Design an enzyme around this catalytic site. Structure first.
Site, PDB file in Angstrom:
ATOM      1  N   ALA A  82       0.851  -1.190   0.000  1.00  0.00           N
ATOM      2  CA  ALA A  82       0.000   0.000   0.000  1.00  0.00           C
ATOM      3  C   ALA A  82       0.867   1.213   0.000  1.00  0.00           C
ATOM      4  O   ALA A  82       1.989   1.176   0.516  1.00  0.00           O
ATOM      5  CB  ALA A  82      -0.839   0.043   1.288  1.00  0.00           C
ATOM      6  N   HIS A 499       8.650  -7.450  13.547  1.00  0.00           N
ATOM      7  CA  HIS A 499       9.585  -6.383  13.892  1.00  0.00           C
ATOM      8  C   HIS A 499      10.968  -6.662  13.282  1.00  0.00           C
ATOM      9  O   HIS A 499      11.973  -6.482  13.981  1.00  0.00           O
ATOM     10  CB  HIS A 499       9.679  -6.468  15.427  1.00  0.00           C
ATOM     11  CG  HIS A 499       9.918  -5.192  16.169  1.00  0.00           C
ATOM     12  ND1 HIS A 499      11.195  -4.754  16.483  1.00  0.00           N
ATOM     13  CD2 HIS A 499       9.067  -4.428  16.913  1.00  0.00           C
ATOM     14  CE1 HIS A 499      11.107  -3.675  17.264  1.00  0.00           C
ATOM     15  NE2 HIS A 499       9.834  -3.466  17.551  1.00  0.00           N
TER      16      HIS A 499
HETATM   17  C1  FDA Z   1       0.811  -6.377  12.064  1.00  0.00           C
HETATM   18  C2  FDA Z   1       1.888  -5.376  12.445  1.00  0.00           C
HETATM   19  C3  FDA Z   1       1.744  -4.673  13.636  1.00  0.00           C
HETATM   20  C4  FDA Z   1       2.695  -3.723  13.989  1.00  0.00           C
HETATM   21  C5  FDA Z   1       3.873  -3.503  13.120  1.00  0.00           C
HETATM   22  C6  FDA Z   1       4.029  -4.239  11.943  1.00  0.00           C
HETATM   23  C7  FDA Z   1       3.049  -5.171  11.580  1.00  0.00           C
HETATM   24  C8  FDA Z   1       3.208  -5.949  10.270  1.00  0.00           C
HETATM   25  N1  FDA Z   1       4.817  -2.511  13.475  1.00  0.00           N
HETATM   26  C9  FDA Z   1       6.088  -2.367  12.769  1.00  0.00           C
HETATM   27  C10 FDA Z   1       6.107  -1.194  11.766  1.00  0.00           C
HETATM   28  O1  FDA Z   1       4.771  -0.913  11.328  1.00  0.00           O
HETATM   29  C11 FDA Z   1       7.013  -1.586  10.604  1.00  0.00           C
HETATM   30  O2  FDA Z   1       8.258  -2.017  11.172  1.00  0.00           O
HETATM   31  C12 FDA Z   1       7.311  -0.384   9.713  1.00  0.00           C
HETATM   32  O3  FDA Z   1       6.076   0.118   9.164  1.00  0.00           O
HETATM   33  C13 FDA Z   1       8.175  -0.860   8.542  1.00  0.00           C
HETATM   34  O4  FDA Z   1       8.570   0.341   7.783  1.00  0.00           O
HETATM   35  P1  FDA Z   1       9.605   0.233   6.598  1.00  0.00           P
HETATM   36  O5  FDA Z   1       9.755   1.595   5.988  1.00  0.00           O
HETATM   37  O6  FDA Z   1      10.789  -0.609   6.979  1.00  0.00           O
HETATM   38  O7  FDA Z   1       8.826  -0.708   5.524  1.00  0.00           O
HETATM   39  P2  FDA Z   1       7.336  -0.655   4.920  1.00  0.00           P
HETATM   40  O8  FDA Z   1       6.909  -2.074   4.883  1.00  0.00           O
HETATM   41  O9  FDA Z   1       6.462   0.289   5.633  1.00  0.00           O
HETATM   42  O10 FDA Z   1       7.493  -0.096   3.453  1.00  0.00           O
HETATM   43  C14 FDA Z   1       8.017  -0.839   2.340  1.00  0.00           C
HETATM   44  C15 FDA Z   1       7.168  -0.370   1.129  1.00  0.00           C
HETATM   45  O11 FDA Z   1       7.818  -0.948  -0.040  1.00  0.00           O
HETATM   46  C16 FDA Z   1       6.764  -1.457  -0.923  1.00  0.00           C
HETATM   47  N2  FDA Z   1       7.462  -2.466  -1.713  1.00  0.00           N
HETATM   48  C17 FDA Z   1       8.045  -3.626  -1.285  1.00  0.00           C
HETATM   49  N3  FDA Z   1       8.685  -4.231  -2.308  1.00  0.00           N
HETATM   50  C18 FDA Z   1       8.559  -3.418  -3.386  1.00  0.00           C
HETATM   51  C19 FDA Z   1       9.026  -3.456  -4.766  1.00  0.00           C
HETATM   52  N4  FDA Z   1       9.776  -4.495  -5.172  1.00  0.00           N
HETATM   53  N5  FDA Z   1       8.666  -2.438  -5.560  1.00  0.00           N
HETATM   54  C20 FDA Z   1       7.898  -1.401  -5.162  1.00  0.00           C
HETATM   55  N6  FDA Z   1       7.440  -1.270  -3.874  1.00  0.00           N
HETATM   56  C21 FDA Z   1       7.742  -2.287  -3.009  1.00  0.00           C
HETATM   57  C22 FDA Z   1       5.785  -2.002   0.066  1.00  0.00           C
HETATM   58  O12 FDA Z   1       4.543  -2.279  -0.593  1.00  0.00           O
HETATM   59  C23 FDA Z   1       5.743  -0.920   1.166  1.00  0.00           C
HETATM   60  O13 FDA Z   1       4.835   0.153   0.849  1.00  0.00           O
HETATM   61  C24 FDA Z   1       4.394  -1.532  14.391  1.00  0.00           C
HETATM   62  N7  FDA Z   1       5.139  -0.409  14.486  1.00  0.00           N
HETATM   63  C25 FDA Z   1       4.730   0.557  15.323  1.00  0.00           C
HETATM   64  O14 FDA Z   1       5.425   1.590  15.435  1.00  0.00           O
HETATM   65  N8  FDA Z   1       3.609   0.463  16.073  1.00  0.00           N
HETATM   66  C26 FDA Z   1       2.805  -0.660  16.076  1.00  0.00           C
HETATM   67  O15 FDA Z   1       1.781  -0.729  16.810  1.00  0.00           O
HETATM   68  C27 FDA Z   1       3.177  -1.770  15.178  1.00  0.00           C
HETATM   69  N9  FDA Z   1       2.478  -2.948  15.086  1.00  0.00           N
END
Ligand code: FDA
Length: 563
Positions: A82, A499
């Site tokens: 997303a 995480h």
């Molecule tokens: C269910 C759940 C629950 C929680 C949490 C995670 C999850 C899964 N976390 C953790 C936190 O939300 C998470 O660690 C961060 O959003 C990750 O941010 P990043 O920028 O690393 O990656 P993130 O995943 O946000 O971004 C990567 C982006 O790259 C895109 N993408 C991937 N591959 C691609 C490609 N080849 N080409 C184009 N686009 C691509 C993806 O679609 C995505 O939009 C959390 N944290 C917190 O602070 N509070 C909380 O309460 C929670 N609870």
């Protein structure tokens, strides 16, 4: 199809970088995002909707290998697909890190990365809505000095927040157990009980994901470009230290094309994708690359190594009647959890550190040195034992009706695993192995935390509200049971805590890092990773607050390097 910067991944971190670099109207930025808007997705916008999006089209639902140290099963590792990334599907909790655990980043060799260096960037990112008096009556509190007032990320408490029997009782029960109420867990000292803030637009009563914070208010910038529903496959190079020329992409119709970057490519695809993009581009372990039909460009064999994740278990009780109140977090130290058994737990852990490090060497086939692993594990040990950083997060909330739910996780397990491509096909699932439960401490601490939660449920005054424990309950695990019965039940019932960090870790190249202290990938001139991949260790709190701060800081480093 040429831009100054290409940001791969319009997620939590990537949107910050695209927002900040596009502040210069003469700099063009392209965001590449595989998903699309979730501005109208009710599973996302609902402030009380955590969990709704699991398994839906906006959840990548990545799959691990069979977890042989745990229950032998494949585990889902959820992530947002997303605009906004995983911030669109997460639990919305806003909590940071222990000051001394950010300071360790500099200790390990990252110059300029300490709590006080990162603190102004946590402030820059945040706009906290001060709690109302009824919110203050429910236990909401903050330290003004550690919260920003003007950043893009709105943070606050639910307009529905109200004091209730459960949260009053939990506060009093933890205080009686020697764990104090703290006003703010985001000032670098996290130990205590707290009514934590969330990434919430309180006025709109919607989840404040990274796109609502950093993208939509800025989307009419003419120099900020979005290619949504577009997948980055790999980087391509100028025809020596490698200079990225651009990114190869696949559009929704299946066509493969190229976009070009004049300055840098910033990879922000998340901890479970950024290392794969590096590998597909020829940056990684040459043996893995050649096995998978890739021509190596940069010999950097720790890409995808040093994966660290936590694992989450759940417990539950049933009240005599309805339970209500604030959602609470508690961050106990090792001695809070273990009390009189602390010295014994510490001695056992101390005796195993070197063996943990020896076992971890094999995970990367020796691309991490034993001595470097021992150094890193000693730093983590000292944070646990000497600085007494929290060893657990424990959430308690009303579960509906008479239910109380707790979710909890050990913060600093020692298990490291890895993630690698399984082919040169960009669509093929990676081999993802977090090695949950690999080391004795990881399960023993989890069991300690579970027994502590059972004790809290039975402690005064909360015990006057609670008829019995229901999960696991006393039939499944009697109070006379040995610790191994707890470890067995935890192994059978855990999930990933979602995480993951460390798969493109910020450390000096000589001790196995993938990025330098400006987040630039070793062996490249103009490629950076800016997302959870770069954190070299876990943090105690919830990841978004720190990832926003890291991305804010990276944006300044990128601007400096352009000048
Ligand atoms: C269910 C759940 C629950 C929680 C949490 C995670 C999850 C899964 N976390 C953790 C936190 O939300 C998470 O660690 C961060 O959003 C990750 O941010 P990043 O920028 O690393 O990656 P993130 O995943 O946000 O971004 C990567 C982006 O790259 C895109 N993408 C991937 N591959 C691609 C490609 N080849 N080409 C184009 N686009 C691509 C993806 O679609 C995505 O939009 C959390 N944290 C917190 O602070 N509070 C909380 O309460 C929670 N609870």
């Amino acid at each position: 199809t040429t831009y100054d910067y290409i940001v791969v991944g319009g997620g939590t971190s990537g949107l910050v970088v695209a927002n900040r670099l596009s502040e210069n109207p003469d700099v063009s930025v392209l965001l590449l995002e595989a998903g699309a808007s979730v501005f109208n997705n009710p599973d996302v916008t609902n402030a009380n909707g955590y969990g709704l999006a699991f398994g839906s089209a906006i959840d990548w639902q990545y799959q691990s290998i069979n977890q042989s140290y745990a229950g032998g099963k494949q585990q889902v590792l959820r992530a947002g697909k997303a605009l906004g990334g995983t911030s669109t599907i997460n639990g919305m909790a806003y909590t940071r890190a222990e000051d001394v655990q950010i300071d360790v980043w500099q200790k390990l060799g990252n110059e300029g990365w300490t709590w006080k260096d990162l603190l102004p960037y946590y402030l820059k990112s945040e706009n906290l809505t001060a709690p109302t008096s009824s919110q203050v009556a429910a236990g909401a509190a903050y330290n003004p000095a550690v919260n920003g007032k003007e950043g893009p990320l709105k943070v606050g408490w639910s307009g529905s927040l109200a004091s209730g029997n459960l949260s009053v009782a939990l506060n009093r029960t933890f205080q009686a157990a020697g764990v104090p109420w703290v006003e703010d867990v985001n000032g670098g000292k996290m130990r205590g009980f707290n009514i934590y803030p969330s990434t919430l637009d309180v006025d709109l009563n919607v989840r404040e994901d990274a796109a609502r914070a950093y993208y939509f208010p800025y989307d009419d910038r003419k120099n900020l470009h979005l290619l949504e529903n577009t997948t980055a496959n790999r980087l391509f190079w100028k025809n020596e230290e490698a200079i990225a020329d651009g990114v190869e992409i696949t559009s929704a119709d299946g066509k493969v094309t190229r976009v070009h970057a004049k300055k840098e490519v910033i990879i922000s695809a998340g901890a479970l994708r950024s290392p794969l993009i590096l590998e597909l581009s020829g940056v990684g372990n040459p043996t893995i690359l050649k096995k998978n039909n890739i021509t190596p460009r940069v010999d950097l064999p720790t890409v995808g190594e040093n994966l660290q994740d936590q694992f989450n278990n759940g417990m539950a009780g049933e009240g005599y009647g309805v339970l209500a109140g604030a959602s609470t977090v508690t961050y106990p130290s090792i001695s809070d959890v273990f009390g009189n058994e602390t010295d014994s737990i510490v001695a056992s852990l101390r005796s195993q550190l070197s063996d943990y490090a020896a076992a971890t060497v094999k995970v990367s086939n020796g691309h991490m040195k034993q001595e470097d692993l021992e150094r890193l594990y000693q730093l983590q040990f000292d944070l646990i034992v000497k600085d007494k950083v929290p060893i657990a997060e424990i959430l308690f909330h009303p579960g509906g009706g008479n239910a109380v739910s707790s979710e909890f996780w050990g913060l600093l397990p020692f298990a490291r695993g890895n993630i690698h491509i399984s082919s040169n096909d960009p669509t093929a699932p990676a081999a993802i192995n977090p090695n949950y439960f690999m080391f004795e401490w990881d399960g023993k601490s989890q069991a300690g935390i579970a027994k502590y939660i059972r004790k809290i449920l039975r402690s005064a005054p909360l015990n006057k509200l609670i008829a019995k424990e229901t999960k696991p309950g006393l039939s499944e695990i009697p109070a006379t049971a040995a610790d191994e019965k707890w470890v067995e039940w935890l192994k059978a019932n855990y999930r990933s805590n979602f995480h993951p960090v460390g798969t493109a870790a910020m450390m000096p190249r000589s001790i196995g890092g993938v990025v330098d202290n400006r987040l630039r990938v070793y062996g490249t001139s103009n490629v950076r990773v800016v997302d959870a991949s770069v954190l070299p260790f876990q943090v105690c709190g919830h990841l978004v607050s720190t990832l926003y701060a890291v991305a804010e800081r990276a944006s300044d480093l990128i601007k400096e390097d352009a000048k």
